[PDB]
Symmetry: C2
């Protein structure tokens, strides 16, 4: 149940390359094996500095395709994040190289570093999440407060808005699922009432 | 198909307590839901300060029993750790309250804090890992550096030990499993020759 030689050799040398990078030694990126045949790795990138993601660590799900290196790996955020180019529900990534701009010269390391660059420079005009993309543009300060809250509760970042977490708690007291309440409130400009109806939809 | 009333109410209440604790706001502990009916949770404790585990974040597999709160939860480390009371191989935990000293009054929060405390003060006279317990007593400086290496590699603590990493890299250079390489070295007082033999058993 193994992959073709060119695929295995590529993944094995790129796995090593990541493990020996200056970026990994500085805890910026990392990757582990999940499947013994290299068909599924587990990544983790650190939230970039001077970013709502600063302090956060984000786990990735890397699934290597049988066609590697001629096709890109399927990458998805395991750790919930609030970003224009990432689905706040599934973790699906909307990025260049993971779709139509992948090149055979790219590596596991390059994909990890690029996902880290994406966190530091979003593309709300080519979003993966319309709800997030829009908030990013219409009310930037609310997006930054929500991204930072998502970073703290899901990725270990320092800690955000007491106001937000008081509302989260109020809705959870009403018996709603915490994760549902967080994305509901984050999608309704943090209005408890409009968020409550969305939770009843 | 869920748990009995007494068990669900405790878990719900304890899951709430954790989220609203001063410790979770300070990034020391936290728990999420893995199952809908509360039978499985996922914790994460912070490496204690002035310890080989400082800077690392540790995930835990928490399985609540049908008899909760009259019996303790089944906690196991998901994140690999080098500690006297924790299997460096399976992550099993040897601790008072998880076995015969559990009390109906203990909570998810207290369990998480007890685990965090155990990292700060090991009990090599009631070990889970004999190899670790022994290295801990016989060569304390090697233990501190191996624990600190395991923390950078699996928990995300700052880097540590150029010598250790080189020996691991050289053995990986042979196509040995990396985690197999790391435990062999760690278990063989970092002797390349003996570890390389263990890696052939």
């Amino acid at each position: 149940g193994s992959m073709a030689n060119i695929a295995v050799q590529r993944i094995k040398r790129e796995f090593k390359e990541v493990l020996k990078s200056e970026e990994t030694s500085k805890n910026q990126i990392k990757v582990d094996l999940v499947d013994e045949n290299f068909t599924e790795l587990r990544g983790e990138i650190a939230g970039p500095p001077d970013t709502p993601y600063e302090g956060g660590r984000y786990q990735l799900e890397i699934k290597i395709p049988e066609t590697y290196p001629f096709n890109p790996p399927k990458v998805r955020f395991i750790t919930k994040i609030w970003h224009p180019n990432i689905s706040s529900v599934t973790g699906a990534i909307c990025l260049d190289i993971l779709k139509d701009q992948w090149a055979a010269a790219m590596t596991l390391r390059t994909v990890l570093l690029s996902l880290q660059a994406l966190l530091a420079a979003a593309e709300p005009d080519d979003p993966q999440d319309a709800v997030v993309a829009n908030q990013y543009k219409q009310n930037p300060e609310m997006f930054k407060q929500t991204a930072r809250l998502w970073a703290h509760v899901y990725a270990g970042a320092p800690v955000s808005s007491p106001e937000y977490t008081k509302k989260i708690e109020n809705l959870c007291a009403m018996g709603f699922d915490r994760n549902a309440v967080i994305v509901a409130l984050s999608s309704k400009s943090w209005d408890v009432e409009t968020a409550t109806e969305l939770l009843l939809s």
